[PDB]
CSV table of C-alpha atoms and ligand atoms in Angstrom, one decimal:
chain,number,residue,atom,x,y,z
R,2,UNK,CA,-92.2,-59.4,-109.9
R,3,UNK,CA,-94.8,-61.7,-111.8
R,4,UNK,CA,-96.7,-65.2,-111.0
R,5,UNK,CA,-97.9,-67.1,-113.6
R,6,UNK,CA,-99.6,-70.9,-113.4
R,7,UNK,CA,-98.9,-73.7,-115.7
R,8,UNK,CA,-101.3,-76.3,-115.8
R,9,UNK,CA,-102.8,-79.2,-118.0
R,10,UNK,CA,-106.5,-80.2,-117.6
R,11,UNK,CA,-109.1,-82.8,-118.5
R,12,UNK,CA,-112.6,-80.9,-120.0
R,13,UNK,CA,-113.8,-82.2,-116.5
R,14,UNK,CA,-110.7,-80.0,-114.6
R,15,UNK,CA,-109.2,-83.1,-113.3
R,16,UNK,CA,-105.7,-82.1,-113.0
R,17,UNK,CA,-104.3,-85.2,-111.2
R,18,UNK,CA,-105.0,-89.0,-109.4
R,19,UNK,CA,-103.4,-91.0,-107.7
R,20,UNK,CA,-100.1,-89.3,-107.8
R,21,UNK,CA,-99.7,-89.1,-111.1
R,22,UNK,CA,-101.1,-86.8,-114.2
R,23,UNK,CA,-103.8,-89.6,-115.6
R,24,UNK,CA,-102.7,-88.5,-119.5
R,25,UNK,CA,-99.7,-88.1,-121.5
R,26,UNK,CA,-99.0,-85.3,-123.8
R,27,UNK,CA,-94.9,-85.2,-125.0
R,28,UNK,CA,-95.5,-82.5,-127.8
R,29,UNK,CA,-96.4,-80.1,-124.8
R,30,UNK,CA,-93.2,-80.2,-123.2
R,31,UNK,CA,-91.3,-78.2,-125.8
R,32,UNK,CA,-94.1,-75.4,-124.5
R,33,UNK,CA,-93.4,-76.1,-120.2
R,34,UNK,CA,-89.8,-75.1,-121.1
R,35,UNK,CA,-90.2,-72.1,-123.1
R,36,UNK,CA,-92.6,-70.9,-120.6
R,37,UNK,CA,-90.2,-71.9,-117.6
R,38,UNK,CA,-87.0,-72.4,-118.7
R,39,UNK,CA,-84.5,-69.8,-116.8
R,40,UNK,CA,-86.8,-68.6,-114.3
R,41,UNK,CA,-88.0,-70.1,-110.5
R,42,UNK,CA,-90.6,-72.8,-110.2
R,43,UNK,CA,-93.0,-73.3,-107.3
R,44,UNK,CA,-94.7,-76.2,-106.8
R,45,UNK,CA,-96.6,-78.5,-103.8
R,46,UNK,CA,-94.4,-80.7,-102.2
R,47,UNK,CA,-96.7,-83.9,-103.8
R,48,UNK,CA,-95.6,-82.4,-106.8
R,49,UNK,CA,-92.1,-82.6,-106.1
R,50,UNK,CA,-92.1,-86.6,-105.2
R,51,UNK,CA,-94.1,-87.1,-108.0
R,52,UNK,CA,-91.4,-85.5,-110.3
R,53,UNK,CA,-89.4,-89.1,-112.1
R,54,UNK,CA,-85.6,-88.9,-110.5
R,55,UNK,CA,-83.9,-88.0,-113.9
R,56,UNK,CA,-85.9,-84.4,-113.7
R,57,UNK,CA,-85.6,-83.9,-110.1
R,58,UNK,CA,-84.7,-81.1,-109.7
R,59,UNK,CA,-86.0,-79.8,-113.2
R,60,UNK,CA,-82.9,-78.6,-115.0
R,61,UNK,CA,-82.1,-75.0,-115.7
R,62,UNK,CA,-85.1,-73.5,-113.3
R,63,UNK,CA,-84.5,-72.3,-109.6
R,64,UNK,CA,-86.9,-75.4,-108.1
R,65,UNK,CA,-89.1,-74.2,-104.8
R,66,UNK,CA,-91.3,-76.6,-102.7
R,67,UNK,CA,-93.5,-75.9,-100.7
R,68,UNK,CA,-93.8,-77.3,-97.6
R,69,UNK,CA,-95.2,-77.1,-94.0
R,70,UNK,CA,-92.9,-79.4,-93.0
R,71,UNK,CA,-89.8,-78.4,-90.8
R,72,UNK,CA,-86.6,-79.5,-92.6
R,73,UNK,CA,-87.8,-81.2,-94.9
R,74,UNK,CA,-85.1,-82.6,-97.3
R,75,UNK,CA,-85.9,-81.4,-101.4
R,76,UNK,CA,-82.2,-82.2,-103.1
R,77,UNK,CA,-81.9,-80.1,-105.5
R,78,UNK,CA,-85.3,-77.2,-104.5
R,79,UNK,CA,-85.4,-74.7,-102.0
R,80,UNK,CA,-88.2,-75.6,-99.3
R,81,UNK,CA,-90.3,-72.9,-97.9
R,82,UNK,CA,-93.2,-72.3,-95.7
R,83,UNK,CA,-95.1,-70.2,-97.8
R,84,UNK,CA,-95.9,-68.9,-101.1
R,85,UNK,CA,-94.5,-65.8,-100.3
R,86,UNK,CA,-91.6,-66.7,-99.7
R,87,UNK,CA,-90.4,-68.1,-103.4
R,88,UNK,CA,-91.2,-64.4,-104.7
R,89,UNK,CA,-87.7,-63.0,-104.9
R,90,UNK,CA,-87.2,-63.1,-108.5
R,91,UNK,CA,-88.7,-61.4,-111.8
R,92,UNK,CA,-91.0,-64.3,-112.9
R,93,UNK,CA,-92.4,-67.2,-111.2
R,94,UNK,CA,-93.6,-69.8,-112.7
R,95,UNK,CA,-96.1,-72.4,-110.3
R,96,UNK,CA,-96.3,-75.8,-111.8
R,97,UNK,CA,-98.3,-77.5,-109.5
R,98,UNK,CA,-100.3,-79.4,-107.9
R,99,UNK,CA,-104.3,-78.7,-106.9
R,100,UNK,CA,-103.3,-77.3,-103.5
R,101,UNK,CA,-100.5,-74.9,-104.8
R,102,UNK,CA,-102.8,-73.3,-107.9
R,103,UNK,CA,-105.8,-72.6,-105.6
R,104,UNK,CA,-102.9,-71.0,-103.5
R,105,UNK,CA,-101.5,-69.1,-105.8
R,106,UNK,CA,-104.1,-68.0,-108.2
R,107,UNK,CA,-104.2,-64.5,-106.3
R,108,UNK,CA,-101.2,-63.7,-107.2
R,109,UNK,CA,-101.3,-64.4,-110.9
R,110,UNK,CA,-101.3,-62.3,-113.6
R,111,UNK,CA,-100.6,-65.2,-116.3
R,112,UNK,CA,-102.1,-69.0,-116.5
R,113,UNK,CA,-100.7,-70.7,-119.9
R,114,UNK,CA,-103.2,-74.1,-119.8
R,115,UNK,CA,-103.5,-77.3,-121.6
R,116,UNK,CA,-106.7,-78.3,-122.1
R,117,UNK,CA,-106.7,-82.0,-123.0
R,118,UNK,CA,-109.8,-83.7,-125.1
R,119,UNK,CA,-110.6,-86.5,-123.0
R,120,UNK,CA,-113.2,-86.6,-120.5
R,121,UNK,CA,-111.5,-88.0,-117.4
R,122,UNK,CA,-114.7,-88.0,-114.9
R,123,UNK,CA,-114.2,-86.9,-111.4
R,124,UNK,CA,-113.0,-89.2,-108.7
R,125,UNK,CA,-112.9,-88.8,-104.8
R,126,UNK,CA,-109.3,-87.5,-104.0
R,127,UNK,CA,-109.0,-86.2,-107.6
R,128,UNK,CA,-106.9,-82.6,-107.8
R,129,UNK,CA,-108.5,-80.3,-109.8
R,130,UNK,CA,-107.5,-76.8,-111.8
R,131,UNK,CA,-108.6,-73.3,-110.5
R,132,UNK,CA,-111.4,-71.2,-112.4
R,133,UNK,CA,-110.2,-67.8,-113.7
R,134,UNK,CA,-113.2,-65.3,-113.1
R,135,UNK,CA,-113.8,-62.6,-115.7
R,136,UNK,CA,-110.8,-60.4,-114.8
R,137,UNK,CA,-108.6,-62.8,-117.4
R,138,UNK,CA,-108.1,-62.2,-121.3
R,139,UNK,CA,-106.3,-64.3,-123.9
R,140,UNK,CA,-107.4,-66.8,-126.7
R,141,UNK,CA,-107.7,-70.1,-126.9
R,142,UNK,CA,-105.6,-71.9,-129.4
R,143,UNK,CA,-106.2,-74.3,-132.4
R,144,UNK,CA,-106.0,-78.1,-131.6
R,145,UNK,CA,-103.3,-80.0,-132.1
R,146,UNK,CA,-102.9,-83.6,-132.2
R,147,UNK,CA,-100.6,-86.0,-130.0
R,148,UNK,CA,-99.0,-89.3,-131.0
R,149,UNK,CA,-101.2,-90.0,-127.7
R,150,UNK,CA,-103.8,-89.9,-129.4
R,151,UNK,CA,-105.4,-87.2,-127.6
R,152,UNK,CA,-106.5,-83.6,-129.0
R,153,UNK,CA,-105.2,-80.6,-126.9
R,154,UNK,CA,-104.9,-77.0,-127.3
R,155,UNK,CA,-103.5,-73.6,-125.0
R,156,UNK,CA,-105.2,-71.1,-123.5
R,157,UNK,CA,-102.8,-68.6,-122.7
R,158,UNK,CA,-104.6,-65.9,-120.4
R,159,UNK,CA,-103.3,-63.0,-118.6
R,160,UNK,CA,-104.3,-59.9,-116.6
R,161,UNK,CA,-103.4,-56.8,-114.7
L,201,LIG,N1,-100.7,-79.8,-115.1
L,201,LIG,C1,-101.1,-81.0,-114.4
L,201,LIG,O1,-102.0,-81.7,-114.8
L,201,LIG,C2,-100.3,-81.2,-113.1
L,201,LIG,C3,-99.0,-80.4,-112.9
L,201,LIG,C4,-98.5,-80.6,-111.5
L,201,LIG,C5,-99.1,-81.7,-110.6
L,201,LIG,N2,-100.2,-82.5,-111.0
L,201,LIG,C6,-100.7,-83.6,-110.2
L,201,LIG,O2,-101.4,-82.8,-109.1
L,201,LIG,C7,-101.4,-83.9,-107.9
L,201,LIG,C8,-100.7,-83.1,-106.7
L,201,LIG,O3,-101.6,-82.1,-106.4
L,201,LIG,P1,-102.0,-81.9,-104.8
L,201,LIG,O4,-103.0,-80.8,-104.6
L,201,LIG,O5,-102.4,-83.3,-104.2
L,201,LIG,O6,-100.6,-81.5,-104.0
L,201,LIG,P2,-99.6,-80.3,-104.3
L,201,LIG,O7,-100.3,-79.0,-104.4
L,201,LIG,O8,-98.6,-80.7,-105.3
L,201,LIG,O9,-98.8,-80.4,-102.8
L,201,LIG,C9,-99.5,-80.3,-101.6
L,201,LIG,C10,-98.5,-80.1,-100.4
L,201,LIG,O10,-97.9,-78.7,-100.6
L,201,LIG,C11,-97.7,-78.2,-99.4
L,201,LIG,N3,-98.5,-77.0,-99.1
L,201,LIG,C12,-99.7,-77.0,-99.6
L,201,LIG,N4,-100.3,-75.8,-99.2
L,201,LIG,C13,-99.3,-75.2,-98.5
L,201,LIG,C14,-99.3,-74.0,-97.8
L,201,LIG,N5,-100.2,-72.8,-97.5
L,201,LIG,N6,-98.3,-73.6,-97.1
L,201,LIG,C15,-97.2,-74.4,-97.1
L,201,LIG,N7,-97.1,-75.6,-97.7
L,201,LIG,C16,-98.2,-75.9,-98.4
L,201,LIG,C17,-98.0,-79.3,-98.4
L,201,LIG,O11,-96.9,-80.0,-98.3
L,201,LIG,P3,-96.5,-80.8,-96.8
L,201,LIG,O12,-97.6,-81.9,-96.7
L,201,LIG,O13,-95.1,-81.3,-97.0
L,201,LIG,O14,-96.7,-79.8,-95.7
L,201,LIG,C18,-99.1,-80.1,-99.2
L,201,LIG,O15,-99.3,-81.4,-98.7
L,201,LIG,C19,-100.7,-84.9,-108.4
L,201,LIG,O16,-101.6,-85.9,-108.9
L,201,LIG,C20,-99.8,-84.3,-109.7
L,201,LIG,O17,-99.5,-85.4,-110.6
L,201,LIG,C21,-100.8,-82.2,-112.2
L,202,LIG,C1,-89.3,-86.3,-118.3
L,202,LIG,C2,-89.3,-84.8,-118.2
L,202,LIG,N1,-88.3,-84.4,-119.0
L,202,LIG,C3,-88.0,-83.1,-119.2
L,202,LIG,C4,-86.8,-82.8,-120.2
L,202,LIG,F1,-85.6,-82.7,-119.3
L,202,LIG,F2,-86.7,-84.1,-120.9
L,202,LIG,F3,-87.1,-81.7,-121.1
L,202,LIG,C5,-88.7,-82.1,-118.6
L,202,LIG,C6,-88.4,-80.6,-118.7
L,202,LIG,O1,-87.3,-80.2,-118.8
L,202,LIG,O2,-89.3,-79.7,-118.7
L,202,LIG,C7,-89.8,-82.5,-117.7
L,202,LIG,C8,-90.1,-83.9,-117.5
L,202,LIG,C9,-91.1,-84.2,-116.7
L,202,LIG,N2,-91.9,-83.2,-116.1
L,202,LIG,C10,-92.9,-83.6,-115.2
L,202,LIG,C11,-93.8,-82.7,-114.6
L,202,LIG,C12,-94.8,-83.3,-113.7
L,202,LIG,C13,-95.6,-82.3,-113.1
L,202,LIG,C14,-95.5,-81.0,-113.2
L,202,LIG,C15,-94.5,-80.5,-114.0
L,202,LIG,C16,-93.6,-81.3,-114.7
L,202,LIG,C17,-93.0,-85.0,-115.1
L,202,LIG,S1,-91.7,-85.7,-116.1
């Protein structure tokens, strides 16, 4: 049994506003579905509503939401109470929100993220990305460009 995050930033660690992810990056998603494709996905229950109707549920994942609520209705995800509770399978992939990686982060021995070249200053309300402490190891990746006009590149980090 593994967790790994998934996450894409602004330099300031802005993750998301206003419901949304304030950026677009299309040439990433070819890298959300290797890294996920086939195995479960966790995320917040915010993260869930925020998914567009054609991808909800994602396809080809086991979807889990989180969710302190009794009975609430995910079509198409599992609800649980807890983290814990998604970790039945081999690999588990959490994909989001702020909430859920600060959750989560304990348990991971792998975060693949996206670090986005724009500078997205904080905001009251704004969710923001975890901080991996020392124990972590990886490389950062060369930039790449997106018809978005943004630069990005990977970290992909991992421990024991
Ligand atoms: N890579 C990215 O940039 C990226 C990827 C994913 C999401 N996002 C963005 O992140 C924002 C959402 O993040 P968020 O922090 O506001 O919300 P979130 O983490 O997606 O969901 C929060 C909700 O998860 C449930 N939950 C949280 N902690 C729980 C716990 N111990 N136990 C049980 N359930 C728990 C609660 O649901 P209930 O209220 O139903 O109890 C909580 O309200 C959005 O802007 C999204 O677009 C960004
Ligand atoms: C349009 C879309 N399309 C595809 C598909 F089907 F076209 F590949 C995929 C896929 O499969 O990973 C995914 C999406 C979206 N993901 C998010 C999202 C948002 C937050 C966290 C994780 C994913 C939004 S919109």
């Amino acid at each position: 049994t593994m967790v790994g995050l998934i996450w894409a930033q602004a330099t300031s660690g802005v993750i998301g506003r206003g419901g949304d992810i304030p950026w677009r990056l299309p040439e990433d998603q070819a890298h959300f579905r290797e890294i996920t494709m086939g195995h479960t996905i966790v995320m917040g229950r915010r993260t869930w509503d925020s998914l567009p109707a054609k991808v909800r549920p994602l396809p080809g994942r086991r979807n889990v939401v989180l969710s302190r609520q009794a009975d609430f209705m995910a079509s198409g995800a599992e609800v649980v109470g807890s983290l814990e509770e998604a970790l039945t399978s081999p690999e588990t992939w959490v994909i989001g929100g702020g909430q859920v990686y600060a959750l989560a982060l304990p348990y991971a021995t792998r975060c693949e993220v996206t670090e986005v070249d724009i500078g997205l200053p904080r905001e009251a309300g704004d969710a923001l990305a975890p901080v991996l402490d020392e124990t972590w190891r990886g490389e950062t990746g060369e930039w790449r460009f997106s018809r978005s006009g943004l630069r990005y590149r990977l970290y992909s980090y991992h421990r024991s």
